[PDB]
RNA sequence: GCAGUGGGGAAUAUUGCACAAUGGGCGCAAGCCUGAUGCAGCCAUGCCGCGUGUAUGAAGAAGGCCUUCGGGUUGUAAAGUACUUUCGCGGGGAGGAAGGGAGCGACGAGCUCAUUGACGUUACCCGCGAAGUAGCACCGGCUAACUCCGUGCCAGCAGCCGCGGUAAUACGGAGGGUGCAAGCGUUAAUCGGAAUUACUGGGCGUAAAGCGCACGCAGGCGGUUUGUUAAGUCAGAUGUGAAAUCCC
RNA sequence: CAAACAGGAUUAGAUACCCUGGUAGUCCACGCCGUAAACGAUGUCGACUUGGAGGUUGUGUCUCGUGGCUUCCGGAGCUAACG
């Protein structure tokens, strides 16, 4: 699966957390609600920096918290 | 504005109340598409693109003794809460007398026109 | 069933229901045309609920059926298509005990119910002893070959001669048989009932 | 009744008499009962006469006595120690009275 | 000819300098059954006097309901005072489903089938007024066409 | 654990019959094991079916009741006549179940033939055949169904409004009547009406209801034209959406 | 000037009203609180819907037109009624 998000942190090495956000209708009201999730994606090349809107795909579990890897960078920067 | 379609609709509702010959409303393809059904259905004489520099839609309203051609007209689908109806969901305004304009992939059409084509969409408003 | 003085029910309902000697000048409704009791004289005061109640009452009393099945049959006829009122009588008129009565095998519905229970009546050959049996069109209702001798049916069928039968029916006094042509419409039936009133009562 | 139970047993604490309210006047027979529910409420004693002592122990039905504010329950006669009314030729269903020969 | 239906009658009492003077009110519905309706509500010191006076008033104010196959031309929602009445055409076999107030007015109206319901105030006097008003606003495609 | 005992509670059962049938474990098989299950018992706890009779029978018994005592009412209702004849008795007596073995064939495939059953001697069929239990609740209004007597704010009734202090259809009895019927009532518990949280369906100056004001974070929302993407949204196809249930 | 309070009166009693005194307080500086029929008891912005009359302020071809502000009367309409 592919997920789009922002690089909210590049503190760790080879590890970048992507803040993916989505919009879903409320099961009762139906009005769209905002929901986000942080995913620790792998980045061996430490190519992606903070502010980068990258794509994320499911991959072989690098660690317990990391099960995703950086595929491609959408845009350059957006702080 | 926030909901141009509602504005236009209101500007005609308030214009007819004062029995004005014509009324202006900021142009927009969607608006024109709507005005098209209003003229064909017989709610308005017609319309015309006006404006020296700013595109407007001069709506020529018409009236009759006793009742006004457009007795009622209100937007049911608003930006705050959009509404969508299926082919069988299309409600009949005043058992046929009145009609409703829906926006489908086939284009803007009335209940009967949409019912015939066999498709549903966003219920723009009721007249 | 009810089982008791039927000649009193006729007075209460106001109309003359055919329970037995309704033909004779005895039927109390001929002597005193007022409901039973020490108050059948004083002027009665009926309400909207009263007219609907007494209405279905006489209806059910005619066929002499319980209030349960009567209600059950009502629900059914109300489910199927077509005017409920019409269908109603159709079902009740479909009862075996009722058919037998219409055919003349029995003096009354009560006696007809007995004949059925006594296995003295057959349907398309096989015998049926259930008064609640629903007779469909094209079904032949004749007397039992063994019962063909009992004086009771002998006298009943004898009086049947020359007597006309309903359009939805057709009997053969000779063979002592009967056939259910079709479901009787409200036009065929001449009951002192106002189907429009009985349907309102159950509305509630 | 606590456990939403139709009835509830209990032991009488005292079988005294009470006087109706403003509009009525009499010596209605009541009795404080310590139900198994853990509550000590007052119940009315229907009938013209009863045989409830201190260790009566009777079942409670539940019913408010308009005249006696506080009495929200009625004692079931014909059960436990509460003997059914004597010579009750009428509504024997209540007061628990066997039909005489 | 015209058939009358007694909707409802009220005792109606009032305090006056001298005591209580009773006056009975009565709602009557006059109709032939082929499209004409008539509502009447007159008072009188005597019940029958009010009933008759009512029938006379009912026949004086009649409406020509444009019936179509035992039904109406289109749904309507008339709102009299705090009372509200809604009407909706229906296929045959449905029957006149509505309160005693509206039905009685619809039966004589000639209506054979219709779906209705009472909203807001349930006042019998205000609902009958709302019903008749709704029967007036009723229009047919012929009228609308010739109207436009 | 099954049945059962004692204790608890308003209250819930035979320490019964049986493996042949179906299914299961082991065995090549024969066969062994199997209170799994198939049944019977107890209890109107519920549901459905049936019976306590059918036809006849006085301008109209007796008795009770009412009376302007003229009479009226309970009534064709009972008695009585005729007919059928649930129980009970006699006889017959069920479906629910083939192989192992033996003969032919190479004791293989295949074919052929023989022996054996709980509930039951019950269901059901035939014959005989006696009229052969009914009760409970309610009758002021909502609720359909009335009088007389007793009592007398006393005794008592009561879901709410109330009723009773000497004429009470709401107290008790009786006659009568209504409802239902081996059932009938009572008590407890669940549902909507409530558009009284109102998404469909609501309100806030005085009936309950704008926070005292400002600034401002997050969040929510956002003007006109064009292009790309197209995540939301919409469309086609396909996979999934167990059985049963519900609907026809 | 005036709670509390000191006395004199009134009264059935007056630990009120009336009359004579009178402390805190009321006044100033600094510190404290956060409430109120903090009421038009109806928050801000934009668009739309007859006019008449009085007033403050700018402009205009100024016995009148036009923009902003402050009142009153009122079309349609709104409100249970008042408005």
Curated annotation (Swiss-Prot), chain A:
Entry GO CC: cytoplasm; cytosolic small ribosomal subunit
Top-rank taxon: Bacteria
Chain's role: One of the primary rRNA binding proteins, it binds specifically to the 5'-end of 16S ribosomal RNA. Also plays a role in translational accuracy; neamine-resistant ribosomes show reduced neamine-induced misreading in vitro.
GO biological process, one term: ribosomal small subunit assembly
Further remark: The strain missing both S17 and L29 grows very slowly and has a rather unstable temperature-sensitive phenotype.
Subunit structure: Part of the 30S ribosomal subunit.
CDD domains: Ribosomal_uS17
Protein name in the entry: Small ribosomal subunit protein uS17
This protein's encoding gene: rpsQ
Sorted UniProt keywords: Antibiotic resistance, Ribonucleoprotein, Ribosomal protein, RNA-binding, rRNA-binding
Keyword Ligase: no
Family: Belongs to the universal ribosomal protein uS17 family.
GO molecular function: rRNA binding; small ribosomal subunit rRNA binding; structural constituent of ribosome; zinc ion binding
Matches recorded under PANTHER family: 40S RIBOSOMAL PROTEIN S11 FAMILY MEMBER (PTHR10744), SMALL RIBOSOMAL SUBUNIT PROTEIN US17M (PTHR10744:SF1)
Lineage summary: Bacteria, Pseudomonadati, Pseudomonadota, Gammaproteobacteria, Enterobacterales
Xref: PROSITE patterns: RIBOSOMAL_S17 (PS00056)
Keyword Amino-acid biosynthesis: no
UniProtKB/Swiss-Prot annotation, chain B:
Gene3D superfamilies (UniProt xref): 3.30.1370.30, 3.30.1490.10
Cellular component GO terms held in the UniProt record: cytoplasm; cytosol; cytosolic small ribosomal subunit
Listed GO MF terms: rRNA binding; structural constituent of ribosome
Pfam families in alphabetical order: Ribosomal_S8 (PF00410)
Keyword Acetylation: no
Any single biological process term in GO: regulation of translation
InterPro entries xref list: Ribosomal_uS8, Ribosomal_uS8_CS, Ribosomal_uS8_sf
Keyword set includes RNA-binding: yes
Record key words, sorted: Repressor, Ribonucleoprotein, Ribosomal protein, RNA-binding, rRNA-binding, Translation regulation
Family: Belongs to the universal ribosomal protein uS8 family.
Subunit structure: Part of the 30S ribosomal subunit. Contacts proteins S5 and S12.
Biological role stated in the UniProt entry: One of the primary rRNA binding proteins, it binds directly to 16S rRNA central domain where it helps coordinate assembly of the platform of the 30S subunit.
Protein's name in the database: Small ribosomal subunit protein uS8
Swiss-Prot record, chain D:
Positions carrying N6-acetyllysine: 86
Consequence of changing residue 66 to Q: Confers low-level resistance to streptomycin and a 15% decrease in the translational elongation rate
Keyword DNA damage included in the entry's annotation: no
UniProt GO molecular function: misfolded RNA binding; rRNA binding; structural constituent of ribosome; tRNA binding
GO biological process: cytoplasmic translation; Group I intron splicing; maintenance of translational fidelity; positive regulation of RNA splicing; response to antibiotic; RNA folding; translation
Keywords, ordered alphabetically: Acetylation, Antibiotic resistance, Methylation, Ribonucleoprotein, Ribosomal protein, RNA-binding, rRNA-binding, tRNA-binding
Record's GO cellular component terms: cytoplasm; cytosol; cytosolic small ribosomal subunit; ribosome
Modification 3-methylthioaspartic acid, positions: 67
Secretion signal, residue range per the UniProt entry: none
Subunit structure: Part of the 30S ribosomal subunit. Contacts proteins S8 and S17. Interacts with ArfA. May interact with IF1 in the 30S initiation complex.
Entry function: With S4 and S5 plays an important role in translational accuracy. Interacts with and stabilizes bases of the 16S rRNA that are involved in tRNA selection in the A site and with the mRNA backbone. Located at the interface of the 30S and 50S subunits, it traverses the body of the 30S subunit contacting proteins on the other side and probably holding the rRNA structure together. The combined cluster of proteins S8, S12 and S17 appears to hold together the shoulder and platform of the 30S subunit.
Similarity field: Belongs to the universal ribosomal protein uS12 family.
From Swiss-Prot, chain E:
SUPFAM superfamilies the UniProt entry points to: dsRNA-binding domain-like, Ribosomal protein S5 domain 2-like
Pfam family, any one: Ribosomal_S5_C
GO biological process: cytoplasmic translation; maintenance of translational fidelity; response to antibiotic; ribosomal small subunit assembly; translation
Keyword Transcription regulation: no
Annotated keywords: Acetylation, Antibiotic resistance, Ribonucleoprotein, Ribosomal protein, RNA-binding, rRNA-binding
Subunit structure: Part of the 30S ribosomal subunit. Contacts proteins uS4 and uS8. With proteins uS4 and uS5 encircles the mRNA as it enters the ribosome, which may play a role in mRNA helicase processivity. Can be cross-linked to mRNA. In collided ribosomes contacts ribosome rescue factor SmrB.
Function: With uS4 and uS12 plays an important role in translational accuracy. Many suppressors of streptomycin-dependent mutants of protein uS12 are found in this protein, some but not all of which decrease translational accuracy (ram, ribosomal ambiguity mutations).
Record-given protein name: Small ribosomal subunit protein uS5
């Amino acid at each position: 699966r592919t997920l789009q998000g922002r690089v909210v942190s590049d503190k760790m090495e080879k590890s970048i957390v992507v803040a993916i956000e989505r919009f879903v209708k409320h099961p009762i009201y139906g009005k769209f609600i905002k929901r986000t999730t942080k995913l620790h994606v792998h980045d061996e090349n430490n190519e992606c920096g903070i502010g980068d809107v990258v794509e994320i795909r499911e991959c072989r579990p690098l660690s317990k918290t990391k099960s995703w890897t950086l595929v491609r960078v959408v845009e350059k920067a957006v702080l | 504005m926030q909901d141009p379609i509602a504005d236009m609709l209101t500007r005609i509702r308030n214009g007819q109340a004062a029995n004005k010959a014509a009324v202006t409303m900021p142009s927009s393809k969607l608006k024109v598409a709507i005005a098209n059904v209003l003229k064909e259905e017989g709610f308005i004489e017609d319309f015309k693109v006006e404006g020296d520099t700013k595109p407007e839609l001069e709506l020529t309203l018409k009236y009759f003794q006793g009742k006004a051609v457009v007795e009622s007209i209100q937007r049911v689908s608003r930006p705050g809460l959009r509404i969508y109806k299926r082919k069988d969901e299309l409600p009949k305004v005043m058992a046929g007398l009145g009609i409703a304009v829906v926006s489908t992939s086939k284009g803007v059409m009335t209940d009967r026109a949409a019912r015939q084509a066999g498709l549903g969409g966003e219920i723009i408003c009721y007249v | 069933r009810y089982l008791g003085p039927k000649l009193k029910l006729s007075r209460r309902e106001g109309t003359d229901l055919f329970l037995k000697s309704g033909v004779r000048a005895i039927d109390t409704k001929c002597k005193i045309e007022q409901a039973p009791g020490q108050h059948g004289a004083r002027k009665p005061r009926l309400s909207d609920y009263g007219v609907q109640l007494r209405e279905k009452q006489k209806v059910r009393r005619i066929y002499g059926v319980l209030e349960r099945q009567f209600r059950n049959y009502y629900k059914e006829a109300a489910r199927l298509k077509g005017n409920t009122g019409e269908n109603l009588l159709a079902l009740l008129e479909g009862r075996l005990d009722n058919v037998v009565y219409r055919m003349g095998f029995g003096a009354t519905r009560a006696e007809a119910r007995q004949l059925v229970s006594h296995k003295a009546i057959m349907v398309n050959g096989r015998v049926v002893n259930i008064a609640s049996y629903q007779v469909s069109p094209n079904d032949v209702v004749s007397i039992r070959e063994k019962a063909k001798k009992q004086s009771r049916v002998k006298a009943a069928l004898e009086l049947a001669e020359q007597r006309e039968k309903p359009t939805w029916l057709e009997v053969d006094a000779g063979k002592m048989e009967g056939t259910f042509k079709r479901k009787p419409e409200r036009s065929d039936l001449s009951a002192d009932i106002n189907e429009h009133l009985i349907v309102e009562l159950y509305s509630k | 009744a606590l456990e939403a139970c139709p009835q509830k047993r209990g032991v009488c604490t005292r079988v005294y008499t009470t006087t109706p309210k403003k509009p009525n006047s009499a010596l209605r027979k009541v009795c404080r009962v310590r139900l198994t529910n853990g509550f000590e409420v007052t119940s009315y004693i229907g009938g013209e006469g009863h045989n409830l002592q201190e260790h009566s122990v009777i079942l409670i039905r539940g019913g408010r006595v308009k005249d006696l504010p506080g009495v929200r329950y009625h004692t079931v006669r014909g059960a436990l120690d509460c003997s059914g009314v004597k010579d009750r030729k009428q509504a024997r269903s209540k007061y628990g009275v066997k039909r005489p020969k | 000819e015209l058939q009358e239906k007694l909707i409802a009658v009220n005792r109606v009492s009032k305090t006056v300098k001298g005591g209580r003077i009773f006056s009975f009110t009565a709602l009557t519905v006059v109709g032939d059954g082929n499209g004409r309706v008539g509502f009447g509500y007159g008072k009188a010191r005597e019940v029958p006097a009010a009933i008759q006076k009512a029938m006379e008033k009912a026949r004086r104010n009649m409406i020509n309901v444009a019936l179509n196959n035992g039904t109406l031309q289109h749904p309507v929602k008339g709102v009299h005072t705090g009372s509200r009445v809604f009407m909706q055409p229906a296929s045959e076999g449905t029957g006149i489903i509505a309160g005693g107030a509206m039905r009685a007015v619809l039966e004589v109206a000639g209506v054979h089938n219709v779906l209705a319901k009472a909203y807001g105030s349930t006042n019998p006097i205000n609902v009958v007024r709302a019903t008749i008003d709704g029967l007036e606003n009723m229009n047919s495609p012929e009228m609308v066409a010739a109207k436009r």
